[PDB]
Amino acid sequence: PIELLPETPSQTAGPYVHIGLALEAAGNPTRDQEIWNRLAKPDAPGEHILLLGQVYDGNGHLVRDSFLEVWQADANGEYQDAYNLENAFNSFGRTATTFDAGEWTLHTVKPGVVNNAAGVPMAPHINISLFARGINIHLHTRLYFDDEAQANAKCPVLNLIEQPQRRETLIAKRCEVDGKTAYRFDIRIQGEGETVFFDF
Amino acid sequence: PIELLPETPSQTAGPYVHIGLALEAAGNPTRDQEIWNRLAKPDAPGEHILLLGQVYDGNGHLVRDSFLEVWQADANGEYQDAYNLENAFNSFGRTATTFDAGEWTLHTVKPGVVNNAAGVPMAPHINISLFARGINIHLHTRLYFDDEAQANAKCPVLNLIEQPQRRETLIAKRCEVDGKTAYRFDIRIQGEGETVFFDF
Amino acid sequence: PIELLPETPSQTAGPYVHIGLALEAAGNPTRDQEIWNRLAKPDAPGEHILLLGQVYDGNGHLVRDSFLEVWQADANGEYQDAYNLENAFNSFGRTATTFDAGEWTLHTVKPGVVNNAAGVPMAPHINISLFARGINIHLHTRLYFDDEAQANAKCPVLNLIEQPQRRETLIAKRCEVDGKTAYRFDIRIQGEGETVFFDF
Amino acid sequence: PIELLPETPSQTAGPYVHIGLALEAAGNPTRDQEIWNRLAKPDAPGEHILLLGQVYDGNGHLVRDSFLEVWQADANGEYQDAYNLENAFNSFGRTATTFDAGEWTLHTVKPGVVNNAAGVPMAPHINISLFARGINIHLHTRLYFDDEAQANAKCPVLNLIEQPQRRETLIAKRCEVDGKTAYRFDIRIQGEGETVFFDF
Amino acid sequence: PAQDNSRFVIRDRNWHPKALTPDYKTSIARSPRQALVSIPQSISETTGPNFSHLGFGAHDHDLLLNFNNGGLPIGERIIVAGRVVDQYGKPVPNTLVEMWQANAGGRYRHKNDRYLAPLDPNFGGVGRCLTDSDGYYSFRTIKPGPYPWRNGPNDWRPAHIHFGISGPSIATKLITQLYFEGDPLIPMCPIVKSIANPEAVQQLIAKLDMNNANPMDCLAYRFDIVLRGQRKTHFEN
Amino acid sequence: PAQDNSRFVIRDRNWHPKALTPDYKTSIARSPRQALVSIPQSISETTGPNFSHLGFGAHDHDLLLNFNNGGLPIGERIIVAGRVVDQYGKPVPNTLVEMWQANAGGRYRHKNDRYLAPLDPNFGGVGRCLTDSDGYYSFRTIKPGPYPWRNGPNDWRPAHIHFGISGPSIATKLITQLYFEGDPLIPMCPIVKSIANPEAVQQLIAKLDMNNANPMDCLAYRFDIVLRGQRKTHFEN
Amino acid sequence: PAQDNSRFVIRDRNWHPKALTPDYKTSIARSPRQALVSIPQSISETTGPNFSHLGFGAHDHDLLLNFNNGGLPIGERIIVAGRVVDQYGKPVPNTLVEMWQANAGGRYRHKNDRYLAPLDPNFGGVGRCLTDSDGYYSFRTIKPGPYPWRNGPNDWRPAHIHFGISGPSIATKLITQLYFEGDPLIPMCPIVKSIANPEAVQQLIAKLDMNNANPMDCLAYRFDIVLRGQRKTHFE
Ligand SMILES: [Fe+3]
Ligand SMILES: [Fe+3]
Ligand SMILES: [Fe+3]
């Protein structure tokens, strides 16, 4: 068969990933421009939300050295790839769990609906890639919202998860933090309540 | 050492096993004669019973595409191998779980006692072979009966299972279905309450 | 793919084939029973015929060391495989061309119609195999009759010969020899008028 | 020595070439635009002519499945390579022999004189490529005209054919079809009168 | 009734695929985590059904004719034939061989198959037969197509026919899959690769069999099946 | 109008099949017995049609859609794609690639084909396209079946697609046949074997191309085509 | 205004390291036990950030100058350079390449690293670059030292530099580690050996590149990166 050049293989990010990719979270000096966890300035259109979560290993213990990358549509359901710290909104961000702060946070807006390649709407979601010591190749997941039940029930990606019970692992829980709308999305890498991870 | 011709290797039966081995269960038209789940004609000797059960995977979720073959002595402890739809009793049958009917059923008689090769009586039992998508080589088990406690305690096959708690996985529970004597035999392929599986 | 034992390869019969297979034609003493050119005793049913012919090489010169084997149905369209010199008719015979007698002869009856494997009638024919010095593997042909024009036109074997002109090479010419019905069938191995040879 | 990438090897076009390259000739439905046998619109410059011919195998039998491609200068000696069904003249066309129409036809104009690479005029000619079942790599030839005898005698390509008698195989015969000027160009692939075929 | 008169050679469960083969994703949750419990052969294991008295239809072995809705199925006409023997080389006569497959496009006639390749109105995909007195079986069918399946993001089954063979006891019963000589999908398939030993994989590949072909009609493939060796009991009790 | 500005590398007629290849029986009477006459390249040979202005239909390259009589064809859905280059490795852009084939069962939609395998009412078997500015072409089709033919008493063509490629001149024009990776019929075919050099045969075998497949939809095969090398004229006259 | 116009060749997850690789002890509890769920590519997966207008500092790619506290760092001066291409051999221009590493003695500038090898007051260990229009990147740094880690009782990482590459979409994003030609620690490392195929391990070993060296100044190593092949959608 046709064999292309093989892809460079993945390796774990390791315990010090933060010195290269999360300088502030590492307690080290930052450069003038950093890619971080504030996707939306206050003036950006749409519903402003706080996302937060904790990451658990297979023994139910906190992962305190996680690094997370997120990719989401704007409130109007468009992906904004031209990354610029002057933008009111950027579709891409980074966050982390650390020893000081075991709970990651993101400041964003709720993403609008986007269609799949066959033109069927997907429920509002945030794409997440999870890196850490012990993770040899990053894990892909999606964060959906518990107040989009009707859309979630019809999502063609959610519906590829064979068991309903496993679908529940991707649904973030609405709450309020300091009077502001927030959603909690905990990730369990292994075992009871194991979060659905994707290949694509 | 002496090496014989190798056996043809097993492969999973896959998700469409019913089109070949359970045509009625597949909702496809049947041929004039099919090997199915009614072992006993109404006037066959012995105690007429219903067997039924569900099959669970390692996540506790129903296996909705399993295919089962059974082999049992008749009520007089004889194996009737000359398969024939005109027989009052066939020792062999087939059943299945499907999307519509997640619970398999078998109509038979309670089997009589047979001796092992050393002449020791075995407790009444049904030999079962389980096939499905995800099962690379079929799993062997035995269904024994909870109202044969004295015989079960003395069975030389049950006594080969080192732990009493695992012996309990092979004991079907007496119940009533539509007012008729029945025994329920659930199979757990993996994890908590995992059913004992045999090699011979 | 599946490969069977290979067939023993053919070799030419060579110039002295007659000492082994045509003893009389070789001018050598015969044994008590020989397989030769009289397929029909006078009492055999059907139309008694003389067949004769000459064999030509690619330069138009006579082949004077040919050996021919023939196989034909009886007048009723049945092949008689139980070869016996006491039979009124045998379906099999042998003839030859020699230096003394360049023209072979056969004494037979006109064969009846036989169907092909799909049940379609073939026109009356004699199967012929030709052997000689210079012929590494024998050549198969058929002799048909010029007074069976209607049957010949519909023969499914004749009709596999793509060109009408080549079909004419297999049609023997009726004549009279000493007041008796005869047919002449000359074979041209190579070049102008080349006789159709078959593979099967 | 310097060895380039090898050319993809030729294979016969086979008996069903018309379904791909001569759809109307195959009696199958045509697409909106097909490359076929009318090179000249009625108002194209030059002398409008019909070309036609038959193709013979080595046994003198008609080739009833041939496919032909032609390439010729226009009447002013120009090769019109921008193929377009709206052109007054196309230098390229296709034609075929079939079971129904054993004689190919081409509607064109008489081509004007073009010079060879050394600047010597070639006699008016049509370049022809012949494909068919049994032809493993297509055969190149040229059709010249019998009423251009002076030019033909001086053609540097015709003069590369060592024997005058073989030069005669490339000269089409002027005739009339339905009262119109025509030239007949029969091709004999093999044997007596074998048409000259070119390599370049 | 059946008697305990024979013993079957123990299975090599490193020649067969193991239960847990994670690249085949459905095996991860449908594989036992405890060891199998070994038990001695008794009459329960060394006997099994014989199907000599099962009534077979005329076309049960002929998939070109057994789903006839006004015409022939579309696809590559093939005979699939072979012999069933045990590990000692003894033929296994009068044994039930069942088979099922997709159509020429990789579509199964099952409600759960939603692949966009069309059903063939003259093809059902199911056959059975009994081996003859010398162990030989034969079916006539069309060659099934590969098809995509939700394992990895671009996984395709090689063309295959599912087989089930009864043999002389429940100890011999086997389900497997036949694949076709030279199919470049075979080395890439996680179900094929559930078999760790490449020599064992080779045993599932049917060979083109020109000798059994019907000229101008259908090709043929040969697939021989080996069941557990059967011997008489000796020196017991 | 066209100009004489290039020369084409001379063909290796021991790499191509020779004319007389008697095992392929129809070649015996359709092969010239006289030598070909070599002639120098002129404008007549170094020019040829360009089909940039030919009007192609929407589905001309898509055999799954271009014979649509109410449904999809039955059979193995495949993309057949590749690149056309010359012997110097230069892409050949805007060139005409035409193809035809049998259906999934080895039956052609031609009156002369009487093979008993049925026609597919949604399959015609004909495609064309122009290579893009980088030399690439693609078709979507179903994989054709082998079929029997009246050569030897049990001869079968391997599965194949017929191709015709124009290239930059009449000197480059080529007709060939594409075969499929691993088909055990390829070594047995007298038409394949008209090519004496086994390395040349390999150049006609399309490779399975999982990278170009559409998951859950169609597989893909890659077939690259090399036409005669083109160079500028130099030091002439 | 990102659009779905491309598909990416599916990953070979037997070429990459598997999740569960027990000799690398931390993978035992941080590996999913359920199968990954395959999903079709959509605009969500086939797009991603472009960092063309991220504002880079003058020394962001030069680790000999980007932690300047009065002198040069101690250690082997090297240039680390290469090309980022996809599996079709197409270069990947204007893509973000980030890297981090320990100092010459195997010590990282992170509070959780308490290895007794000292920090270097003129070294920080962090770089970033965008590939140029032909897919090339380059950093200047010091060769990192190996270092011990609490896996087995005497386990040591080979000298290595951590790398992250964005590529054209979130589907191509990759984190990996670069190792150095000839290092005898490479075959012993359970993190290297998380990669089962030895030919894949070879793809992470940077080669000494004398052609790129500055005589009398610094050596150079070459590390080419291949991301997933990108093709146009067809017949969807
Ligand atoms: Fe299947
Ligand atoms: Fe063909
Ligand atoms: Fe490190």
Curated annotation (Swiss-Prot), chains A, B, C, D:
Coiled-coil ranges from the UniProt annotation:
none
- Which cofactors does this gene product need? Fe(3+)
For the ligand (3,4-dihydroxybenzoate), the binding residues are: 133
Report the EC number(s), separated by commas if there are several: 1.13.11.3
Q: Which reaction does this chain catalyze?
A: 3,4-dihydroxybenzoate + O2 = 3-carboxy-cis,cis-muconate + 2 H(+)
Molecular function via GO: ferric iron binding; protocatechuate 3,4-dioxygenase activity
The UniProt entry's GO biological process terms, in alphabetical order, are: beta-ketoadipate pathway
The UniProt keywords, alphabetically, are: Aromatic hydrocarbons catabolism, Dioxygenase, Iron, Oxidoreductase
Free-text comment on the cofactor: Binds Fe(3+) ion per subunit.
**Role summary:** Plays an essential role in the utilization of numerous aromatic and hydroaromatic compounds via the beta-ketoadipate pathway.
**What does the subunit section of this Swiss-Prot or TrEMBL entry state?**
The enzyme is an oligomer of 12 copies of the alpha and beta chains.
Its recorded name reads: Protocatechuate 3,4-dioxygenase alpha chain
| Organism the protein comes from | Pseudomonas putida (Arthrobacter siderocapsulatus)
UniProtKB/Swiss-Prot annotation, chains E, F:
Write the protein's name: Protocatechuate 3,4-dioxygenase beta chain
Q: Does the keyword Zinc-finger apply?
A: no
What positions does the entry give for Fe cation binding? 108, 147, 160, 162
Q: Which InterPro entries match?
A: Intradiol_dOase_C, Intradiol_dOase_core, Intradiol_RC_Dioxygenase, PCDO_beta_N, Protocat_dOase_b
Which gene is this protein's source?
pcaH
Organism of provenance: Pseudomonas putida
Q: Does the keyword Oxidoreductase apply?
A: yes
The family annotation for this protein states: Belongs to the intradiol ring-cleavage dioxygenase family.
Recorded catalytic reaction(s): these are: 3,4-dihydroxybenzoate + O2 = 3-carboxy-cis,cis-muconate + 2 H(+)
